[PDB]
Amino acid sequence: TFTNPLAEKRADPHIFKHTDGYYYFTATVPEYDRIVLRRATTLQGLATAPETTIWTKHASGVMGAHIWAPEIHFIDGKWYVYFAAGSTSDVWAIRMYVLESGAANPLTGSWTEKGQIATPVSSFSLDATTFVVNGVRHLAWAQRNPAEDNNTSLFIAKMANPWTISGTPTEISQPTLSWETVGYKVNEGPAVIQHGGKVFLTYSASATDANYCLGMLSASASADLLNAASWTKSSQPVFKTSEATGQYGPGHNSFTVSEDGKSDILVYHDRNYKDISGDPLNDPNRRTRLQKVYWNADGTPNFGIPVADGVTPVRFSSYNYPDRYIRHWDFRARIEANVTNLADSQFRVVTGLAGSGTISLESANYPGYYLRHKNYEVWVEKNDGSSAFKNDASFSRRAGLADSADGIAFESYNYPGRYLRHYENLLRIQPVSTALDRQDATFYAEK
Numbered sequence: 001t002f003t004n005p006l007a008e009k010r011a012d013p014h015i016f017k018h019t020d021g022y023y024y025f026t027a028t029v030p031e032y033d034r035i036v037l038r039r040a041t042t043l044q045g046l047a048t049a050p051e052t053t054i055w056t057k058h059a060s061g062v063m064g065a066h067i068w069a070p071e072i073h074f075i076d077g078k079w080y081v082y083f084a085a086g087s088t089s090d091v092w093a094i095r096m097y098v099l100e101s102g103a104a105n106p107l108t109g110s111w112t113e114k115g116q117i118a119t120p121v122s123s124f125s126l127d128a129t130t131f132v133v134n135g136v137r138h139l140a141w142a143q144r145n146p147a148e149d150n151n152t153s154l155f156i157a158k159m160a161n162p163w164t165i166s167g168t169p170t171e172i173s174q175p176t177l178s179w180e181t182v183g184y185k186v187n188e189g190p191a192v193i194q195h196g197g198k199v200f201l202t203y204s205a206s207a208t209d210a211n212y213c214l215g216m217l218s219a220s221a222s223a224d225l226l227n228a229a230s231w232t233k234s235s236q237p238v239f240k241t242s243e244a245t246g247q248y249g250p251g252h253n254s255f256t257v258s259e260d261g262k263s264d265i266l267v268y269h270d271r272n273y274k275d276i277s278g279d280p281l282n283d284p285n286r287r288t289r290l291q292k293v294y295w296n297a298d299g300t301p302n303f304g305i306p307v308a309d310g311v312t313p314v315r316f317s318s319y320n321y322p323d324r325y326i327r328h329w330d331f332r333a334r335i336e337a338n339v340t341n342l343a344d345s346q347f348r349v350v351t352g353l354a355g356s357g358t359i360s361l362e363s364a365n366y367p368g369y370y371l372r373h374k375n376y377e378v379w380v381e382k383n384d385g386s387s388a389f390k391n392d393a394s395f396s397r398r399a400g401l402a403d404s405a406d407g408i409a410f411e412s413y414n415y416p417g418r419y420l421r422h423y424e425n426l427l428r429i430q431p432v433s434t435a436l437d438r439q440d441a442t443f444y445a446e447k
């Protein structure tokens, strides 16, 4: 579990997990004047990790304005920071730059400017990221194609070294879809996650307001990534505003991994209100958040929806049907495999509504709704403040009935002796007496 937000007033978050046992976190600060860095042995530990300013804007000329979207990478024994910056003369003449350090600790180490990342076209450029596919390092970034009437398109290239591309860039996406062209016609913030022999390049689209969202390109890892034909663009956003959870304009993401290395983590920013207040560039309230990526059966990532503030939700799978998860459909609770609408299968465990050390299970996509029983059937329904609802939505957490060590079972608070159990895949509360009943009433959280 994570507690969101991770950091207030930090946009364009980048987190890098190093082999020294630390996560390193950099981001865009509201002043746009410097590159900050913090570190911690765990992801949650980053929330209270102190920042060091590692580099500050130049007093005059290039690298002197709009210090935007730093990423930190460890490459061939050295640290590299990728960032964007305009000039004091022309604040909107934004280009891409790199810093290098050979120090073990990048917080305290000394940094060297490696200069601008050169590209054949001299145009607005930012959001450089680097990644390796099958021993070949690539750079992906956002840049204006001057022959297109838009803001930025996505480019990719091979690299000669961490600060220089090799050969010619290829344009692999341009903003053309309705959801990419709201306010401004933008593809920016590329980020790469790899899974199942596929390469998924997420990116941000539209203006940086509530319309901000993630798109995604997909390619095979065996394909020529410099051939635009290798990439397939998702026709709809893969991550967007959720009014229900009060999360607006989620975007400019990166990817990291959990403490145990086994789960992929989506790192992004958003706001908790819709309408921009004041000069859009100057609204400082974007905050950094974390949530686990779930992998669809078809090998594609499922980002779900930006989750409610506070503790993150979990998924509950069945003991006897390990691929089936508790989910709601038309508000009825069932167990089901291959949940495409991920958030129907996410619930957060909260202090019981009926107190006395019980727990309740709050819907991730319908905050304020809970798993509750009525006529012994389990539904996801809105808390109305009634005693009946509170009682019907509270359970005693028990050791699993088929797995005392690792499983979980849920005993009704108002009907002791009855447990949450599935029957013909639908969830009910019933007494447990047989081996099969015990299995039907045992679940696992995050397994």
Ligand SMILES: OC[C@@H]1O[C@@H](OC[C@@H]2O[C@@H](O)[C@H](O)[C@H]2O)[C@H](O)[C@H]1O
Pocket (backbone or CB within 6 Å): 092, 124, 151, 152, 184, 186, 188, 206, 207, 208
């Ligand atoms: O996120 C950076 C950028 O901000 C918005 O574009 C503003 C536009 O960019 C300059 O080239 C022009 O001077 C200014 O009108 C978009 O959200 C994105 O491209």
Ligand SMILES: OC[C@@H]1O[C@@H](OC[C@@H]2O[C@@H](O)[C@H](O)[C@H]2O)[C@H](O)[C@H]1O
Pocket (backbone or CB within 6 Å): 328, 329, 330, 331, 332, 341, 344, 365
């Ligand atoms: O469980 C609540 C909600 O039901 C599912 O959506 C229901 C489905 O959507 C309409 O297009 C159909 O008329 C209706 O059956 C969601 O998956 C879930 O959040």
Ligand SMILES: OC[C@@H]1O[C@@H](OC[C@@H]2O[C@@H](O)[C@H](O)[C@H]2O)[C@H](O)[C@H]1O
Pocket (backbone or CB within 6 Å): 320, 422, 423, 424, 425, 426, 436, 440
């Ligand atoms: O909830 C799934 C399963 O339903 C109940 O079994 C009833 C019937 O018999 C099984 O062979 C089929 O899976 C099902 O249609 C069990 O109580 C429960 O495990």
Ligand SMILES: OC[C@@H]1O[C@@H](O)[C@H](O)[C@H]1O
Pocket (backbone or CB within 6 Å): 011, 012, 028, 068, 069, 084, 126, 127, 188, 189, 208, 252
């Ligand atoms: O948040 C600062 C800039 O705005 C975003 O649109 C760009 O990706 C980032 O460089």
Ligand SMILES: [Cl-]
Pocket (backbone or CB within 6 Å): 338, 339, 340, 341
């Ligand atoms: Cl589904």
Ligand code: NA
Pocket (backbone or CB within 6 Å): 014, 069, 071, 127, 128, 129, 189, 190, 191, 252, 253, 254
């Ligand atoms: Na980035």
